Write a protein that binds this ligand. Structure first.
Ligand code: ZN
Lengths: 84, 49, 330, 155, 368, 54, 84, 291, 122, 144, 141
RNA sequence: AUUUAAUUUUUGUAUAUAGUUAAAAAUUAAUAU
RNA sequence: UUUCUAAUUUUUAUAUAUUGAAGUAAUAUGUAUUGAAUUGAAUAUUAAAAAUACAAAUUUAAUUUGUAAUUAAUAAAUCU
């Protein structure tokens, strides 16, 4: 992830949006990417969008816990399922 | 095996407002307080009878 | 069944040179940052969790506030209100009292009349508890200098000899500083510095004419509080109730951290105040050789889930929480 | 086994087409030795997996058998002053010339009548006294000349 | 690529105790040996000796700037510390001049003073002129100079093409290509380049369309073996072998195969220059290129040859922007006798024989 | 340097044989007999990842 | 003919070196050119692989028994200033 | 004023051969022949360590360990005083062997010496590698001014700058001439006090281990509640009392006086006092660790 | 389009619009610093400038000389190229043939003074 | 490099320059020769229209020349036309020369003797002043 | 994955064979070969017959021991004019060997002076049979 | 670069003797909008 | 699985460090005995002797020297 950060820090962020937009909208290609091209990644604060007046995002992180790394391609074969 | 569940899971709760009541505004599983602590904005206008 | 025209194991797909450079991982691994610091690994949720997870407290601005340099300070007129309260306490040691006076300086230069009795009441009381020392003399002399009452600096200095106390190495600087900021020319600070060199209380390794310059060219870098030239002439303080970076360091390594849990700050102040049968004390050798590189380097249990949760040290605070002003900058 | 790869770019050609031309004389090519020895060299088979001048006798020390024609005529005792090659011995031959157009970096391309050689010992010390033939300029390298003392003159 | 990796210097340790010269901390206004002491004194961390006169630094630095003046002969190369190279002037490691379009014209065999035969292809530089100067959003390292060639009737170009040259003011040129230059190597739109822009000892890089060969099979396109002549082989004299392995099922991309065999843009990287007929605008290279006569071939410079810059001090310095012949000089007077430039000896020794080291003199021939 | 299969097998054979945190792996490094008495705890390579060495 | 490396280091920092000009027996013109006839040694032991970090060292006479001379919570020395 | 390259004749003499930059069969090292996409500069190898590409180059953020790209806004006690927060550069393998920028150059002028009156001609003391670290001409100023010469003390040259930093076991007579230790047994104390810390220093000095001349140390019982004094007198007669800070003990005082012994013997060597050979070498300099 | 190719075919005209912005703002900052004071911090000294870096010659951790190359192309000098005519080339350059066979470097101490700065190698 | 980049033999293509290179092989790249059986897509060869054999192609070159001479027009089809017009500029290059070498070098080539009796009479009178391009190749519109 | 393999831009596909009449190609090769008969590398030839045989005395100044001097009997005459080709293919029968070698005729070290009046269609056949008998009986059989 | 030469340092080390390199050899060059 | 609807089982679970304790001193049954070419606490075996504390080692052909001198270093306090 750091060797990817040398190349472009914005790509480290774009890889993860793709993983949350492809968390439901994988089915058809049009809706797989059309959201992705709605966010604007900037490795620093300066950005051309004062003319759009981006309203701040009143949001505090919910999980104080850390991020586990779960392999894409991890298969959960059986779930707690009441019928056991 | 099965299809992956691609539904829309609900999002986790926002943080409650700071306490500044001293009424034990912090307590979660108490009889008095409904879970939601949403004293947002022009809620005083929503004056209920 | 041999002799291929194409010798070598040049792989087929992995050729991009950006995501797979043709460099032997033996020679490429030495760049993998195993001490990677800037893409920081401490979110902002924790900065407050790890605050309270030390036992630290959040005071309102008037009592104190982590300043622009993330160094907790006490606000004057909140310092004196401690000394008003805990002067009788059994655990208010010697250097506690003088530290009160030093905090009373950025007001005794701004309120030279209403706060020049606090200094003396710290002075007059300090002698009643502890006989008479240099701490209280160097401090109150420095306080009398900032009050621009140079005559009081002279009136304090001549009592060091009157009490046998040989004027300390500072007791010249407290005077050198006084004779300067009080509008008096040199040869009233020079004649003081030249006293110090002869008595060996101060040491100057240069021709005596130039060390005195290097002295004053630090004593005008430190210009008075009411002037507008120097560092003390700056009044801007970073108002912060908690330091913006709770894991900052003041050494070389993460285990040389800056903010230490109360329950370890105490077991530190213990060993620095007991016998030192392992590490020598008062010497530039420091037997305990710093090697914060050869120490442990790996994410623990508390580097992933974040700091534990100890309930904030917070006051039910019956006094009315009234907000009834905006106070700032002393 | 110096090979090439016919690809309109790597291609031996035939000689007659510039330096590094072609045909490095594969394993067995029945050379015609010319030392002053028992080797009567209507045959002396080659046994090393290459031979040439651009391929540079300088480096390889090309082992060669002797598919003997083994004398014109000799006689005496059972064991004599050893210059008389046994019919099957293996010797590191020093190729002199070729029947093939060997272009050089001077544009001079020489084609000789018979491709010859001189038997040399295991230690590159020529097993022969004189030499009854010429030798291209690929000799004069300190590799063999220091033992190939200029048995004669070159071309 | 070992011996190609330059000296490795980690960024984390390019600090004061490393700098080969006195390390200089800037304060925004003036350089000074010491770190900037932040004016808000609260900003200082505790136990961080904010230095204002360090008798160890100041004296090591006193011995530098004084001794450079005292004994100048010795410390001459240390003057690039404070006297940096100005812009222009052909910086050795920086400047990159453009290249000139060319035409393959014929082939000749040429020999040195020594008898080294060079198959020399002689390229004609018909009419090379700067047709337009480019960029990419005015960025750095993205500056390109375009060079015309071969003055041509305005009809032989399509009207949409010729309407460009007519706009630029240059006479309409048959062909034009874009060379990357470093901005200090520009010229005015309308500069007529001349062949002497190259130096007889240079090493040029040529790019052309290597001669088309049609749709050649695999034993020609690449080198494939295959097929005994009279030893069986029902129908297999030239067909390829197994394409995939067995179970990949997916002809791994990159299988060599049959193909169109070579009408592509080819490149020779470091071919040196042999002669220059600056009266005929001919430039002779000691090589054979595989292109039909008339193949427009563009000539950059070879940039670095064996870890060493081409245009360095010891080895020739180029006519930096481009060679502009003097005003007294013209070519209509002189003849091919005088218009001929030649190169140094490319090969150290006559190459039919070996180097003087391997050839042995009679002294050892008389080994005794 | 023979990986002493568990950490607990580590023993300081020489006076100069001490412990060291060579990147999260407790090892034994000795100036004397430099590789002769060297021991290194068994653990993942210093630069592993989550898909290669779990 | 020890260690064929032969100009393998050729490098000593401005720090951690000592000075610049030696000469064997002769003088240039300066009427004082008795310098060294010096020696050509190895740099300080293994350069920074052992100690990548160094703490700031004051002049010796400023180092030993560094006196505590303060102004309002700052330590003023004849050369150094620091927030105690 | 030599020639930096061998000449053909010079190269030919030794039996060597001229290196080909030419049509040779060899590699003719030129990586970037196909990989570097864009304008490539005649600096030989400025893109190899990155991976021999020129790809990304536009981002300013890079994974930075201590003292690299964006670390400049953190306080690291080393890189605080060892790198100006401006010049901090890119990541490790993304080093800048060549950085090209656009804009008008501003070459700020060099700094000048502080506390040095202009034109004041200084006497020059020349140092170099040759001097073994034992040499006094090694640990002191190089350029000796009349400004940094203490005259209130007799000094022929500004004092030393750097001092060796090593731990001293024993109180060997480095250059002292008389080490007196005054106490007042009228003062009393159980446990570690200054009375105990100074009196073991007498034992630790009089020890059969320390090479200190046992007959040159003088005990002195005082009366008037004199805090334990330790007074050392050097050959020049300038007495020195190591300050007995509370919590001190033997190995500190044996360390204080011995460490100061090198400074004080330096000041004696500055006034012009000739110095003697010292037997002990507390600073290991002629020693190597063997096994 | 792949993943990484996508992110660029989306962000390629999003970085250009970003830097072309700053320059377009760089002209704004270049205005209100005309009538303003000499220079602020303002990301340096705040003309369109590049300060010089005296800190470029390093001796790396392995004791080997590492020089940083920094070239600062002047926007006013380059346009001063694309207008004027370059001077006629000196005849001592082209009428001389460039040497082919760069010869290896020979070490040397400068003069009778053995300064030479490699520290050694013998 | 020193040897040609593509060694002794390789067929470039239709529509390819000569790219002269040092080689042992012989290439004409010129076709001034009269009444020649050099059919091919090279430069020194006239276009080889299709036929069963280079013999039978020569047999088609006979009855299509002896029918252009017999009646001054022949509506010939395809790649025979560019291959015939060069045989009409050769017959006149044979009929102009006149010497009894040529009159046979056409007698060997024409199926009928009266033609070689005609070609040598009208053509010296006809083309006495034209020196090349004796055959006009005008294309009819409706493809066969 | 895939690859172009054919570049048909207007710069690469265009050919200058049209505009090539601007260049007097051979009249350069004349002068090109004229600057090699002046340096002394070559001496003019105008000969079609009268050169099919002669008597060159080659002086290949090979640095090997010393210049090699081989009496020879030319049998090529490769080019028939003073141009760059040259090509004598002298037979040269060194002492016992037979070495059909052909001189490029432009080489400064490979010099040779032929003499006419022996250019006999007989003396040529004299050597051809001499090299035909040498060729055949040299295969090592 | 894996069919090894000749230089050159065969001295360091010890019973024989190393190590960057260079020449030569294995002879060929490569860009989709 | 008639159809609209409602629902309590969720490809989100906590990962072992603070401390290269390395200064502080001449000795004294004694170099025990045996086996040993030799052995003195550290060849081999033998190990419950003593007195005025320091015999399971490194070291040396043996010894002496010289390393070493049974210590603060509370992860437990769950984190939601
Ligand atoms: Zn050990």
């Amino acid at each position: 992830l750091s060797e990817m950060y040398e190349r472009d820090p914005c790509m480290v962020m774009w890889w993860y949006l793709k993983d949350e937009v492809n968390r439901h909208f994988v089915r058809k290609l049009k809706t797989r990417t059309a959201p992705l091209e709605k966010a604007w990644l900037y490795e620093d604060s300066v950005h051309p969008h004062a003319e759009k007046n981006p309203r701040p995002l009143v949001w505090t992180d919910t999980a104080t816990m850390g991020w586990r790394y779960k392999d894409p391609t991890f298969q959960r074969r059986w779930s707690p399922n009441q019928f056991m | 095996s099965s299809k992956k569940d691609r539904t829309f899971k609900v999002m986790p709760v926002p943080p409650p407002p700071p306490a500044t009541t001293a009424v034990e505004q912090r307590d979660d599983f108490a009889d008095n307080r409904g879970l939601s602590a949403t004293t947002r904005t022009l809620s005083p206008t929503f004056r209920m009878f | 069944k041999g002799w291929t025209h194409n010798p070598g194991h040049t792989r087929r797909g992995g050729k991009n040179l950006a995501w797979r450079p043709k460099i032997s991982d033996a020679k490429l691994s030495q760049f993998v940052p195993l001490a990677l610091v800037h893409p920081r690994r401490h979110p902002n949720n924790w900065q407050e969790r790890q605050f309270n997870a030390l036992g630290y407290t959040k005071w309102p601005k008037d009592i104190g506030f982590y300043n622009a340099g993330d160094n907790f300070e006490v606000t004057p007129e909140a310092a004196w209100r401690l000394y008003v309260h805990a002067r009788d306490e059994p655990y208010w040691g010697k250097l506690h009292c003088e530290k009160t006076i030093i905090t009373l300086l950025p007001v005794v230069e701004k309120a030279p009349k209403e706060n020049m009795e606090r200094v003396l009441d710290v002075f007059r009381h300090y002698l009643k508890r502890y006989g008479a020392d240099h701490y209280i003399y160097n401090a109150v002399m420095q306080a009398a200098a900032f009050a621009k009452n140079y005559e009081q600096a002279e009136q304090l200095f001549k009592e060091m000899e009157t009490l046998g106390l040989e004027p300390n190495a500072q007791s010249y600087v407290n005077m050198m500083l006084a004779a300067k900021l009080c509008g008096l020319p040199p040869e009233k600070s020079e004649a003081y510095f030249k006293r110090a060199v002869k008595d060996g209380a101060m040491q100057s390794v240069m021709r005596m004419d130039t060390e005195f310059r290097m002295w004053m060219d630090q004593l005008d870098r430190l210009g008075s509080f009411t002037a507008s030239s120097g560092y003390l002439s700056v009044n801007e303080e970073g108002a912060k109730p908690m330091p913006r970076d709770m894991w900052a360091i003041w050494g070389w390594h993460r285990s040389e951290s800056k903010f230490i849990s109360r329950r370890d700050l105490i077991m530190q102040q213990v060993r620095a105040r007991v016998h030192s049968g392992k590490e020598l004390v008062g010497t530039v050798y420091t037997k305990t050789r710093r090697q914060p590189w050869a120490k442990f380097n790996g994410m623990l249990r508390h580097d992933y889930n974040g700091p534990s949760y100890r309930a904030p040290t917070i006051f039910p605070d019956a006094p009315e929480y009234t907000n009834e002003a905006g106070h700032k900058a002393f | 086994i110096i090979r090439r790869k016919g690809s309109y770019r790597s291609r031996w050609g035939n000689g007659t087409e510039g330096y590094g031309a072609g045909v490095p004389l594969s394993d067995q090519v029945k050379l015609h030795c010319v030392d002053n020895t028992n080797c009567k060299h209507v045959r002396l088979i080659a046994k090393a997996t290459a031979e040439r001048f651009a391929h540079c006798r300088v480096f390889p020390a090309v082992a060669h058998r002797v598919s003997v024609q083994r004398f014109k005529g000799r006689g005496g005792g059972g064991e004599v002053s050893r210059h008389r090659v046994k019919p099957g011995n293996i010797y590191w031959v020093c190729l002199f010339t070729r029947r093939q157009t060997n272009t050089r970096m001077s544009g001079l391309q020489t084609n000789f009548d018979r491709n010859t050689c001189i038997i040399m010992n295991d230690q590159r010390v020529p097993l022969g006294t004189r030499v009854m033939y010429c030798a291209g300029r690929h000799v004069n390298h300190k590799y063999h000349l220091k033992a190939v003392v200029l048995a004669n003159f070159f071309v | 690529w070992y011996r190609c990796y330059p000296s490795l210097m980690e960024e984390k340790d390019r600090d004061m105790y490393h700098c080969y010269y006195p390390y200089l901390f800037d304060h925004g206004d003036k350089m000074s040996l010491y770190p900037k002491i932040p004016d808000n004194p609260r900003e200082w961390q505790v136990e961080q000796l904010q230095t204002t006169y360090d008798a160890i630094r100041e004296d090591k630095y006193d011995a530098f700037v004084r001794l450079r003046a005292k004994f100048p002969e010795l410390y001459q190369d240390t003057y690039a510390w404070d006297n940096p190279p100005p812009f222009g002037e052909f910086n050795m490691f920086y400047s990159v001049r453009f290249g000139m379009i060319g035409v393959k014209a014929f082939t000749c065999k040429d020999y040195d003073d020594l008898g080294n035969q060079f198959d020399c292809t002689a390229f004609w530089f018909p009419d090379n002129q700067i047709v337009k100067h480019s960029t990419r959003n005015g960025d750095v390292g993205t500056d390109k100079v375009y060079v015309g060639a071969m003055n041509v009737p305005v009809e032989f170009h399509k009207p949409h093409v010729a309407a460009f040259y007519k706009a630029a003011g240059v006479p309409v040129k048959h062909v034009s290509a874009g060379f990357p230059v470093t901005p200090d190597a520009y010229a005015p739109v309308g500069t007529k380049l001349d062949v002497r822009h190259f130096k007889p000892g240079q090493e040029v890089t040529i790019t052309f369309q290597n001669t088309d060969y049609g749709y050649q099979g695999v034993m020609f396109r690449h080198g494939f073996d295959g097929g005994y002549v009279w030893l069986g082989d029902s129908k297999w004299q030239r067909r390829p072998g197994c394409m995939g392995a067995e179970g990949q099922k997916r002809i791994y991309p990159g299988h060599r195969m049959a193909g169109q065999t070579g009408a592509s843009a080819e490149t020779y990287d470091g071919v040196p220059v042999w002669r220059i007929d600056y009266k005929n605008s001919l430039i002779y290279l000691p090589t054979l290129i595989d292109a039909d006569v008339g193949t427009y071939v563009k000539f950059r410079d070879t940039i670095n040859t064996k870890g060493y810059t081409l245009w360095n001090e010891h080895r020739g310095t180029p006519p930096f922007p481009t060679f502009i012949p003097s005003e007294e000089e013209d070519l209509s007077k002189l003849a091919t006798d005088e218009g001929q430039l030649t190169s140094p000896p490319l090969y150290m020794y006559f190459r039919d024989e070996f180097a003087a080291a391997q050839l042995v003199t009679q002294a050892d021939v008389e080994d005794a | 340097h023979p990986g002493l299969v568990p950490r607990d097998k580590l023993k300081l054979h020489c006076e100069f044989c001490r412990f060291h945190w060579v990147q999260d792996t407790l090892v034994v490094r000795c100036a004397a007999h430099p590789k002769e008495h060297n021991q290194r705890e068994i653990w993942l390579e210093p630069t592993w990842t989550w898909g290669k060495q779990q | 003919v020890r260690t064929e490396d032969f100009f393998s280091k050729e490098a000593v920092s401005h720090a951690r070196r000592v000075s610049w000009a030696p000469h064997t027996t002769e003088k240039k013109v300066g009427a004082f050119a008795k310098l060294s006839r010096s020696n050509f040694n190895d740099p300080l032991p293994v350069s920074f692989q052992s100690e990548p970090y160094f703490e700031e060292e004051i002049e010796a006479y400023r180092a030993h028994h560094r006196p505590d001379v303060y102004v309002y919570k700052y330590n003023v020395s004849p050369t150094h200033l620091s927030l105690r | 004023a030599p020639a930096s390259h061998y000449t053909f004749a010079n190269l030919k003499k030794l039996g060597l051969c001229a290196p080909q930059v030419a049509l040779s069969r060899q590699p003719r090292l030129r990586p970037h022949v196909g990989h570097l996409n864009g304008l490539v500069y005649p600096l030989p190898y400025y893109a190899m360590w990155r991976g021999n590409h020129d790809k990304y180059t536009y981002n300013q953020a890079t994974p930075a360990r201590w003292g690299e790209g964006n670390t400049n806004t953190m306080y690291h006690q080393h890189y605080a005083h060892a790198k100006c927060p401006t010049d901090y550069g890119r990541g490790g393998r993304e080093f800048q062997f060549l950085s090209v920028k656009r804009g008008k150059l501003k070459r700020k002028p060099l700094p000048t010496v502080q506390y040095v009156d202009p034109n004041s001609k200084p006497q020059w003391v020349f140092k170099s590698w040759h001097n073994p670290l034992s040499a006094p001409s090694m640990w002191e100023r190089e350029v000796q001014y009349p400004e940094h010469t203490p005259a209130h003390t007799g000094a022929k040259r500004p004092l030393a700058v750097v001092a060796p930093k090593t731990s001293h076991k024993h109180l060997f007579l480095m250059h002292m001439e008389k080490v007196t230790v005054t106490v007042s047994p009228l003062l009393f104390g159980y446990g570690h006090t200054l009375q105990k810390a100074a009196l073991d220093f007498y034992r630790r000095g009089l020890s059969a281990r320390s090479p200190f001349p046992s007959d040159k140390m003088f005990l002195y019982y005082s009366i008037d509640h004199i805090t334990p004094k330790i007074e050392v007198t050097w050959l020049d007669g300038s007495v020195y009392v190591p300050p007995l800070i509370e919590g001190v003990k033997a190995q500190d005082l044996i360390q204080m006086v011995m460490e100061q012994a090198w400074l004080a013997a330096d000041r004696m060597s500055a006034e012009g006092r000739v110095l003697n050979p010292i037997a002990i070498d507390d600073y290991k300099w002629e020693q190597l660790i063997a096994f | 389009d792949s993943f990484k190719e996508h992110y660029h075919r989306v962000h390629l005209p999003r970085r250009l619009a970003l830097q072309r912005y700053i320059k377009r703002e760089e002209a704004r900052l270049s205005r209100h610093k005309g009538k303003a004071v000499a220079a602020a911090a303002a990301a340096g000294v705040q003309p369109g400038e590049v300060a010089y870096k005296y800190n470029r010659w390093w001796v790396s951790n392995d004791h080997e000389f590492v020089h940083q190359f920094a070239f600062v192309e002047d926007p006013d000098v380059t346009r001063e190229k694309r207008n004027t005519l370059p001077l006629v080339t000196k005849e001592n350059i082209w009428k001389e043939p460039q040497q082919t066979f760069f010869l290896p470097f020979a070490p040397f101490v400068r003069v009778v003074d053995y300064a030479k700065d490699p520290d050694t190698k013998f | 490099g020193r040897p040609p980049p593509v060694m002794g033999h390789a067929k470039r293509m239709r529509f390819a320059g000569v790219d002269d290179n040092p080689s042992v092989t012989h290439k004409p790249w010129d076709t001034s020769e009269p009444l020649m059986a050099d059919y091919g897509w090279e430069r020194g060869k006239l276009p080889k229209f299709r036929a069963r054999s280079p013999f039978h192609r020569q047999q088609i070159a006979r009855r299509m020349v002896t029918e252009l001479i017999r009646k001054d027009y022949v509506i010939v089809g395809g790649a025979r036309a560019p291959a015939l017009r060069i045989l009409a500029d050769h017959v006149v290059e044979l009929a102009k020369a006149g010497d009894t070498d040529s009159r046979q070098q056409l007698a060997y080539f024409l199926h009928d003797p009266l033609m070689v009796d005609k070609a040598f009479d009208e053509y010296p009178r006809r083309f006495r002043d034209m020196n090349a391009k004796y055959a006009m190749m005008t294309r009819l519109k409706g493809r066969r | 994955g895939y690859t172009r393999e054919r570049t048909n831009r207007h710069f690469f596909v265009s050919r200058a064979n049209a505009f090539f009449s601007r260049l007097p190609i051979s009249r350069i090769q004349r002068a090109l070969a004229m600057e090699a008969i002046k340096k002394g590398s070559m001496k003019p030839w105008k000969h079609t017959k009268e050169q099919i045989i002669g008597s060159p005395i080659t002086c290949n100044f090979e640095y090997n021991p010393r210049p090699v001097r081989l009496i020879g009997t030319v049998m090529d005459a490769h080019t028939e004019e003073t141009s760059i080709k040259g090509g004598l293919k002298v037979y040269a029968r060194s002492e016992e060997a037979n070495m059909m070698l052909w001189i490029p005729a432009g080489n400064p070290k490979l010099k040779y002076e032929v003499t006419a009046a022996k250019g006999s269609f007989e003396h040529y056949l004299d050597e051809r049979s001499k090299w035909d008998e040498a060729w055949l009986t040299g295969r090592a059989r």
